[PDB]
């Protein structure tokens, strides 16, 4: 695999995101060799924008 | 006394007030009819200020220079009842609110939809959380000791540096 | 509308608004200052807003101090 | 292609009138110009600093020759009292003959301006007399002026540049700066006032011509140097002297009386001696503190690594504070201006109540005048020394070195700092706002015995404990048994209790309900303003908004519509946010001072006592009652000297309202516009034949704010200044 | 008040004050410290011609290292100290605790 | 006492010198 | 244990050194090294306790007057400073200060320069004309001395409020107060007036 | 009644309620005692 599995609690590591120190849930991550960002997150509460989901590399998430 | 402050009992300034309040609303008073309402109204003014001054002189309150009383706030013990005694009355009921507000939000955190719950309030689940506003300093003094109270800093979203 | 209604107050005040006597002799509310003194922007800040102002600000302890606080809020 | 932004190339390429006005508006920014090195950049400065310098000297100067010119010096000499100042001369081919006749005053000639700086009390006391003596002064600041643009433009040659390293040499430059610009500038000073300005106040004439004659004490530098400097003090000026008069003057020159003259009500001159004498002392010992070339000093550097807490609390501490304060330019300035700022006020808030100079104290219009400019001054300084705090932060912060030293913890947790500064401010405007309206609404329903009238009985005691007897709580020199009222009654408590005993002057002056509420709104107004600064200073580098500001500059317009809005999110619109709170600060800072001043000088301090507590007695009986000679200047029934203050008042209503005008309608309506009459202007015949080279557009968004930003504060200070100086000097109380 | 043997005195007594008792913590403290560093290096290595340590001033035969830097300083916290005590003495204060 | 007209001279003199002064000092930070 | 039975003691004091009843509700000697300088400054503070005790009482017993008049003659002046009723000649206000400051300061400088922790705290050797360090008994006379020590601190902290609390008093005139009337004359009379 | 309740709930109902509930205490406190600076004790 990737990273996390499907449907567990990860939090966020990346400093510019808006889920900074924050928890979501991992809806889907693709095993095809080139991805960057390939681990999708869903989260509670959306961004400025309005948006609640967005894609993370494994590196920069942790398991609660 | 007190920064030079005279008691109000003997301040010929908060008498002197007394007089011409009482003898502007006599004045008012002159127009009209014994028995008229206005007449009953101005008379109820006259009585509402007189035991207003009454009130105020009894309670050794300090008039400055004139008529007019000042408080004292820096804790004296023949004051407490300006500032420290409402003050901490004040500090019983706000802490209340917040107290209880703070427990709403927790016992709605839980909920599936809790923006629902914000905009729509569970009355029921608020009217038993406002219940237990009566002990708040105790609850407020446990969840403190036990962690309860404050949030990790871990935890807690920051904007980068 | 601001500045529609100030000449309408200060024209009235000084030019119709009054009282007559039994004599004949019509005295105004403000004395007929418009036509030498609304030429003139200080004329406008010191006849009107400022002479007609005094009573708005010193309706304190009457019936008109509802006024004064409403005008100080609206501020 | 080099066009008027020489030193941008982006704004020389620009064909629109956006070109001209950011080249005027960013020429001294010069770490943002094209090709620019350190070392010219601070070669630049250098020659930059020259020339303000022969700016300021040359502003000085041209005050003393017009005074000399066109003033009545001696006169206000020989009769201070009565006698009104003369600023200069007017020549103004548009005034008509009342004007002329209105505007001859001090005894001219001819129309005239009446001073309020204070620079005739100013010379008086530091021994000028004649018009003789201030020509020589401004021909002498010419030369000095002179020198420092000849110098300015010797360093910039190449020959005589310096180089980046001597502009780092921190410790030389403290060194040099605390002792000789300091210290022996101080002790030059009070060997002036020894020897020019004491004698002059005792009615001798000490010159060039006579001053190695001139003996400054009978006992010339002999108890000096055998140790008994007590022979300098003991014949002090008698009660009963008068300033430049030989009756009841003494022959002491460095007495420790305290308090003020009883004529001049101004401190003594030899008690000014004394100080320069004494801070010079200090100050030239405190320069031979930091290391330079002799192996003896200390390493400023090591200083800040070796002051670190063991228990982590702060964590590293202050290393890595040295090259991160001497490598960037915009810290340094941020200090100094901080610095600089606190100075101004304690400057303000200690010559109106300790007057230094003859004959100021009577002066109310100078004083009030003094005050308002230095507080104002103040003000944009502090706000300018915040400002380049965010500039440093955005621009010269490097997190690499500043890792876990007091800068990373103030990052670390600056949301802390600015929600409790938002706490403060909140519950301070909540309850004094409060407490306001709870008088006026007493007030208005005709039971003023309901107010909340809260005693500042912390500052009474503070002013019992400085020898006030008013408030009767006998201690810390109010008592006779306290040890400091021992120690200090043989030296300067007969002197400092007796003037602050005396409630006709503004030394500690009666406080009540009114100045609690008073001082509460300036708390609040402080912590607002600092809140909006320091919010800027901690989110310029970024936020949950815009993590990526700092690769945007200090200064850009907004990051568009998206994620909600993005207007004024930089730290340069957190600065044009907070100058409206510091004007407003000071301007209740000014209102204050200015109220107070005017029933202690009337005598009747009653008003104030009653009236201060509740807003509505703010607004009759100070703007309302205080503006009727100010508008009564000109009016259709004739004009008076007042006439140009009345104007300038109404000047500076004018210049507020169009501020507003730049402040609310923001840019697309004029962008608009102005393509709608360039289409009008080429449509034209007559007019289509004269063509424009630069493409007229509307205003940017930061260019629109500033606009707005100065014409608010123009019309801000020119309406305060006029009300202020029309009000004190149309009634002289 | 002598002002002769006071100011001798106290010169004396600061000099050997810094001879004997303080010239090794003032030497200790000063290497610690070291030169003055502008960026990592000292300002003459920085390139100030003007910041070189004076080495030919600095020279001294005094087995301790007592430098005629060190001298005038501690020769001028005597004088301070002395003048300090006559100024007191010469005073005629005395607030009679 | 008032000043004269050599006074007077004398300091528009000076004063046209720091203004060539000022102006070279300004030609320096041009370039 | 120790200062509060039954209490966890804090890891960095385990018990070995003298006087160590682990009583550090602060955390001040957290940092080991900053722990070695506390000791010392204790052991330094303690001494001069100890040393001013008897200056302080003996004085006063013997009807010298108390420690609190005993800078009074400098507070006058020409005090004219007397020892055991005999006045000193050498006792004027600009020389016995300057012997001080001289004396203390070359004894603060020979202990300041002295490596090991251990002969900074215990140095020995011409400090033990009497032996006293041959025997077995060199640590329980350690715990000993650190017990009359923080005795001697507390007791001239005693001294220090007790002046303030009743100006123009000595010490051993408290004692004698107490003992005439112990249940009027207590510290209730300055705390609860 | 589950909708007419629901609606009653709302913040701006509850809020009505609540707040002229207050005021309505608070005025009949000022009926009974009024003009009061010191709270006597
Ligand atoms: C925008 C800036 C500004 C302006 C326009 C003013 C304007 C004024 N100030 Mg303010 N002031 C300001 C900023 C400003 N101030 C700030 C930032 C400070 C804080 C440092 C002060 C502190 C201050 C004080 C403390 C006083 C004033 C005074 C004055 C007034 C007299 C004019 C003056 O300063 O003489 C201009 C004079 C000069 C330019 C000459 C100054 C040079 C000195 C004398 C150098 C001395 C060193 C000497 C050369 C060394 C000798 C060398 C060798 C022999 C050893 C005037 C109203 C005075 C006043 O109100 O009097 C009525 C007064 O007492 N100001
Ligand atoms: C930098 C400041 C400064 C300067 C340049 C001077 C310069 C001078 N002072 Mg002054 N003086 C100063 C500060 C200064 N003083 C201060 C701060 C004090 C107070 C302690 C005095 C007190 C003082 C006295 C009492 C006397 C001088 C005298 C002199 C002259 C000494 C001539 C000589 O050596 O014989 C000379 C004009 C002497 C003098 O004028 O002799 C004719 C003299 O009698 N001065
Ligand atoms: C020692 C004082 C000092 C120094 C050396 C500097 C130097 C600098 N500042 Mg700082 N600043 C200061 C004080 C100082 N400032 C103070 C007191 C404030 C608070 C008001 C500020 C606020 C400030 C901001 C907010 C910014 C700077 C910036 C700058 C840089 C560029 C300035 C520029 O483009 O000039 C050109 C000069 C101007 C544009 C000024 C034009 C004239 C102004 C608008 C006033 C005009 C008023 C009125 C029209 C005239 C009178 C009219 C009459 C009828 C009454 C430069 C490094 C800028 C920077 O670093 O960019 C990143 C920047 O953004 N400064
Ligand atoms: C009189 C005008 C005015 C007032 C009252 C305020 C009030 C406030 N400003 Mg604003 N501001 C103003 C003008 C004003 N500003 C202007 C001209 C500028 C320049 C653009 C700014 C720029 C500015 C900035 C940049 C900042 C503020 C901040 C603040 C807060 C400071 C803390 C405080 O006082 O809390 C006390 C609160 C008040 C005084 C607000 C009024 C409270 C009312 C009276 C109570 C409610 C009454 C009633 C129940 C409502 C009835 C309505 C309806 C239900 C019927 C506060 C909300 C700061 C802030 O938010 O920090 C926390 C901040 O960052 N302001
Ligand atoms: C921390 C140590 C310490 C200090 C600072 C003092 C300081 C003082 N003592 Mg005390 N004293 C001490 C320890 C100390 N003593 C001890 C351990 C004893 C017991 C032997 C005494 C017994 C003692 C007596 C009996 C008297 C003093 C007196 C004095 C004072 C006169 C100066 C003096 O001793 O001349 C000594 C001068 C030379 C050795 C030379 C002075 C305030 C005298 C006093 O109270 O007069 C005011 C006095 O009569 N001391
Ligand atoms: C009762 C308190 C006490 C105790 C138990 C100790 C115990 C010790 N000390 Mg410490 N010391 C004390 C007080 C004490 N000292 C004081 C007050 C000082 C300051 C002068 C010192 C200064 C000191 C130094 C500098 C050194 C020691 C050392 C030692 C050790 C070896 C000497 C010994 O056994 O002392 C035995 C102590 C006694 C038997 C106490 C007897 C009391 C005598 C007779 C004096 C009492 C006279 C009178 C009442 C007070 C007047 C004072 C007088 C000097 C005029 C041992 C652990 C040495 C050490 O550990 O190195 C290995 C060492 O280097 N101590
Ligand atoms: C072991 C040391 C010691 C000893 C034996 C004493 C003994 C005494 N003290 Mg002192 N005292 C001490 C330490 C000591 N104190 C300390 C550390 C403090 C500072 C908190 C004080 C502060 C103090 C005050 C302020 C007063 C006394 C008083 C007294 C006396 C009567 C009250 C009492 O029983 O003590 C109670 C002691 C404590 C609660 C401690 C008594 C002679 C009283 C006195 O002299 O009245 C005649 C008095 O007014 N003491
Ligand atoms: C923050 C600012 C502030 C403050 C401190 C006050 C304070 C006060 N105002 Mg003012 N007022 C303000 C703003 C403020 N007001 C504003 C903005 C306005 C304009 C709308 C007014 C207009 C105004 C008027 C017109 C009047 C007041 C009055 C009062 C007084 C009593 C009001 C009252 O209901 O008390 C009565 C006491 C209570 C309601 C007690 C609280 C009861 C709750 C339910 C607690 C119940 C007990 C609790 C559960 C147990 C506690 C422990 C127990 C042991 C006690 C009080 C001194 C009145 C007065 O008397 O003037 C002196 C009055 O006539 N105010
Ligand atoms: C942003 C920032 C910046 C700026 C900042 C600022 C601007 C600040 C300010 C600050 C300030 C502005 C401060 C102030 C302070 C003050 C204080 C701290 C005070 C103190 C006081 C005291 C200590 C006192 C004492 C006393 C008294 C009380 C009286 C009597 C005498 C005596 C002395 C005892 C910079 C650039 C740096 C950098 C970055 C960051
Ligand atoms: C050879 C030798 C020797 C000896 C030597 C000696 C002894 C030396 C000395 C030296 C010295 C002995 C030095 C000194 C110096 C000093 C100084 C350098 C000082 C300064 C001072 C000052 C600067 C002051 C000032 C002042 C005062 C205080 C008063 C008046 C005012 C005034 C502020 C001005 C012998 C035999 C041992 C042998 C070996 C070698
Ligand atoms: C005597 C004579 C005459 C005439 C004369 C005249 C006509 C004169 C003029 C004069 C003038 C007409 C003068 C002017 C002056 C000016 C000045 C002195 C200025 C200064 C300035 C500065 C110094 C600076 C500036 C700056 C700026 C503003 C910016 C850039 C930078 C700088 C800083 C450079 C006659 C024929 C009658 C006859 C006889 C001879």
């Given at each position: 695999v990737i990273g996390p599995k499907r449907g567990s609690i990860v939090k966020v590591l990346r400093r510019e995101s808006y889920w900074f120190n924050?928890?979501?849930?991992?809806?889907?991550?693709?095993?095809?060799?080139?991805?960057?960002?390939?681990?999708?997150?869903?989260?509670?509460?959306?961004?400025?924008?309005?948006?609640?989901?967005?894609?993370?590399?494994?590196?920069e998430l942790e398991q609660s | 006394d007190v920064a030079g402050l005279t008691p109000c009992k003997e301040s010929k300034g908060f008498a002197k007030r007394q007089k011409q309040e009482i003898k502007k609303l006599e004045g008012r008073l002159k127009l009209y009819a014994p028995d008229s309402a206005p007449a009953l109204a101005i008379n109820a003014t006259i009585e509402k200020t007189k035991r207003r001054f009454e009130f105020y002189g009894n309670q050794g309150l300090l008039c400055g220079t004139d008529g007019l009383p000042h408080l004292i706030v820096d804790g004296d013990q023949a004051h407490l009842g300006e500032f420290v005694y409402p003050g901490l009355v004040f500090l019983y009921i706000a802490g209340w609110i917040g107290w209880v507000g703070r427990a709403y939000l927790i016992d709605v955190r839980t909920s599936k939809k809790p923006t629902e719950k914000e905009i729509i309030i569970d009355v029921p689940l608020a009217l038993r959380i406002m219940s237990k506003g009566l002990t708040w300093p105790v609850a407020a003094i446990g969840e403190l000791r036990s962690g309860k109270l404050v949030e990790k800093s871990s935890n807690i979203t920051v904007s980068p540096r | 509308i601001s500045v529609v209604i100030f000449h309408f107050s200060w024209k009235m005040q000084s030019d119709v608004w009054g009282s007559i006597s039994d004599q004949g002799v019509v005295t105004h509310i403000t004395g007929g200052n418009f036509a030498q003194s609304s030429i003139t922007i200080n004329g406008w800040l010191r006849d009107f807003l400022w002479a007609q102002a005094?009573?708005?600000?010193?309706?304190?302890?009457?019936?008109?101090?509802?006024?004064?606080?409403?005008?100080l809020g609206a501020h | 292609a080099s066009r008027f932004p020489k030193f941008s190339r982006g704004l020389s390429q620009d064909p629109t009138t956006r070109r001209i006005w950011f080249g005027i508006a960013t020429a001294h920014d010069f770490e943002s110009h094209d090709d620019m090195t350190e070392e010219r950049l601070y070669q630049k400065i250098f020659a930059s600093h020259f020339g303000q310098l022969a700016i300021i000297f040359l502003w000085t100067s041209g005050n003393l020759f017009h005074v000399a010119w066109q003033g009545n010096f001696e006169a206000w000499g020989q009769d201070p009292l009565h006698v009104r100042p003369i600023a200069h001369a007017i020549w103004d081919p548009h005034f008509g003959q009342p004007a002329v006749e209105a505007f001859t005053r001090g005894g001219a000639s001819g129309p005239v301006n009446i001073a309020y700086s204070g620079v005739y009390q100013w010379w008086y006391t530091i021994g000028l007399r004649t018009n003789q003596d201030l020509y020589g002064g401004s021909i002498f600041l010419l030369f000095v002026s002179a020198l420092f643009l000849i110098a300015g433009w010797l360093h910039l040659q190449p020959k005589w540049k310096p180089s980046v390293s001597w502009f780092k040499n921190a410790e030389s430059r403290l060194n040099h700066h605390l002792s000789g610009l300091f210290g022996v500038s101080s002790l030059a000073w009070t060997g002036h006032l020894v020897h020019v300005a004491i004698p002059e106040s005792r009615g001798e004439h000490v010159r060039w011509n006579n001053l190695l004659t001139?003996?400054?004490?009978?006992?010339?530098?002999?108890?000096?140097?055998?140790?008994?400097?007590?022979?300098?003090?003991?014949?002090?000026?008698?009660n009963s002297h008068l300033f430049g008069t030989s009756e009841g003057a003494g022959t002491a020159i460095l007495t420790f009386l305290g308090g003020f003259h009883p004529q001049t009500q101004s401190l003594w001159l030899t008690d000014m001696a004394h100080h320069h004498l004494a801070i010079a002392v200090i100050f030239i010992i405190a320069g031979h503190m930091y290391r330079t070339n002799f192996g003896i000093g200390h390493s400023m550097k090591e200083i800040l690594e070796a002051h670190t807490p063991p228990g982590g609390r702060l964590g590293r501490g202050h290393k890595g504070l040295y090259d991160t304060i001497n490598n960037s330019l915009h810290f340094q300035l941020g200090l100094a201006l901080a610095s600089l700022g606190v100075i101004t006020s304690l400057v303000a808030q200690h010559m109106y109540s300790l007057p230094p100079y003859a004959f100021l104290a009577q002066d109310f219009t100078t004083?009030?005048?003094?005050?308002?400019?230095?507080?104002?001054?103040?003000?944009?300084?502090?706000?300018?020394?915040?400002?380049?705090g965010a500039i440093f932060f955005i621009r010269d912060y490097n997190p690499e070195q500043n890792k876990d030293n007091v800068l990373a913890r103030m990052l670390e947790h600056k949301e802390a700092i600015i929600s409790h500064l938002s706490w403060a401010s909140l519950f301070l405007g909540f309850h004094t706002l409060g407490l306001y309206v709870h008088n006026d609404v007493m007030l208005a329903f005709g039971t003023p015995e309901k107010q909340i009238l809260i005693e500042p009985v912390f500052a009474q005691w503070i002013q019992s404990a400085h020898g006030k007897a008013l408030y009767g709580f006998d201690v810390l020199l109010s008592s006779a048994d306290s040890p400091a009222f021992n120690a200090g009654q043989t030296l300067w408590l007969p002197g400092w209790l007796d003037a602050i005993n005396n409630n006709s002057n503004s030394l500690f002056l009666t406080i009540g309900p009114g100045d609690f509420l008073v001082h509460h709104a300036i708390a609040l107004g402080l912590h607002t303003t600092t809140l909006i600064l320091v919010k800027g200073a901690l989110d310029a580098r970024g936020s949950k908004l815009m993590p990526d500001k700092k690769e945007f500059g200090y200064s850009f317009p907004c990051d568009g519509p998206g994620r909600g809005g993005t207007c004024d999110i930089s730290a340069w619109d957190a600065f044009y946010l907070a100058v409206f709170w510091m004007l407003n600060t000071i301007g209740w800072v000014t209102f204050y001072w200015h109220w107070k001043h005017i029933t202690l000088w009337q005598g009747n301090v009653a008003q104030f006592n009653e009236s201060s507590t509740y807003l509505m007695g703010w607004l009759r009986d100070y703007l309302w009652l205080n503006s009727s000679q100010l508008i009564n200047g000109y009016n259709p029934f004739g004009m008076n000297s007042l006439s140009v203050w009345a104007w300038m008042f109404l000047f500076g209503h004018l210049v507020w309202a169009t501020g507003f005008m730049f402040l609310i309608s923001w840019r697309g309506y004029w962008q608009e516009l102005i393509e709608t009459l360039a289409w009008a202007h080429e449509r034209t015949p007559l007019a289509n034949l004269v063509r424009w080279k630069d493409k007229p557009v509307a205003l940017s968004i930061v260019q629109a704010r500033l606009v707005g930003l100065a014409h608010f504060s123009v019309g801000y200070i020119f309406t305060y200044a006029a009300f202020l100086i029309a009000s004190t000097s149309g009634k002289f109380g | 008040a002598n002002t002769a043997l006071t100011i001798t005195l106290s010169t004396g007594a600061l000099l050997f004050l810094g001879r004997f008792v303080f010239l090794p913590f003032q030497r200790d403290n000063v290497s610690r410290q070291g030169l003055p560093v502008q960026n990592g290096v000292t300002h003459f290595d920085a390139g100030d011609s003007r910041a070189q340590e004076v080495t030919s001033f600095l020279k001294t035969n005094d087995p301790a290292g007592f430098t005629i830097v060190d001298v005038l300083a501690w020769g001028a916290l005597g004088h301070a100290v002395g003048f300090f005590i006559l100024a007191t003495i010469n005073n005629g204060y005395n607030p009679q605790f | 006492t008032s000043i004269s007209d050599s006074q007077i001279i004398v300091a528009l003199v000076s004063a046209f010198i720091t203004g060539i002064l000022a102006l070279r000092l300004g030609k320096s930070l041009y370039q | 244990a120790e200062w509060l039975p039954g209490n966890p003691r804090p890891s960095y004091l385990d018990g070995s050194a003298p006087g160590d009843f682990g009583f550090d509700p602060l955390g001040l000697g957290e940092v080991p090294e900053n722990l070695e300088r506390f000791k010392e400054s204790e052991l330094i503070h303690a001494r001069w306790a100890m040393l001013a005790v008897p200056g302080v009482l003996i004085p006063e017993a013997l009807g010298y007057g108390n420690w609190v008049s005993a800078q009074?003659?400098?507070?006058?002046?020409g005090g004219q400073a007397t020892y055991l009723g005999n006045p000193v000649p050498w006792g004027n206000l600009p020389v016995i200060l300057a012997i001080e400051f001289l004396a203390i300061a070359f004894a603060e400088s020979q202990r300041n320069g002295e490596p090991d922790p251990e002969k900074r705290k215990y140095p020995g050797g011409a400090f033990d004309p009497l032996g006293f360090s041959k025997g077995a008994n060199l640590e329980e006379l350690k715990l000993k001395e650190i017990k009359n020590g923080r005795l001697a601190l507390v007791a001239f902290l005693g001294f220090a409020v007790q002046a303030i609390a009743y100006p123009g008093t000595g010490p051993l005139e408290n004692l004698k107060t107490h003992l005439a009337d112990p249940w009027h004359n207590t510290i209730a009379h300055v705390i609860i007036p | 009644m589950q909708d007419v309740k629901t609606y009653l709930s709302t913040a701006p109902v509850l809020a009505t309620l609540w707040f002229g509930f207050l005021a309505g205490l608070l005025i009949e406190i000022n009926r009974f005692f009024p003009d009061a600076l010191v709270l006597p004790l």
């Open positions: 924050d928890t979501g849930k991992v809806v889907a991550v693709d095993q095809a060799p080139g991805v960057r960002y390939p681990v999708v997150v869903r989260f509670d509460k959306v961004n400025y924008a309005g948006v609640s989901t967005n894609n993370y590399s494994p590196d | - | 005094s009573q708005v600000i010193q309706s304190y302890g009457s019936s008109l101090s509802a006024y004064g606080l409403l005008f | 001139a003996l400054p004490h009978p006992q010339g530098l002999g108890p000096f140097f055998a140790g008994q400097w007590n022979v300098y003090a003991q014949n002090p000026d008698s004083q009030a005048a003094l005050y308002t400019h230095h507080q104002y001054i103040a003000g944009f300084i502090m706000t300018g020394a915040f400002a380049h | - | - | 009074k003659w400098a507070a006058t002046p | -």
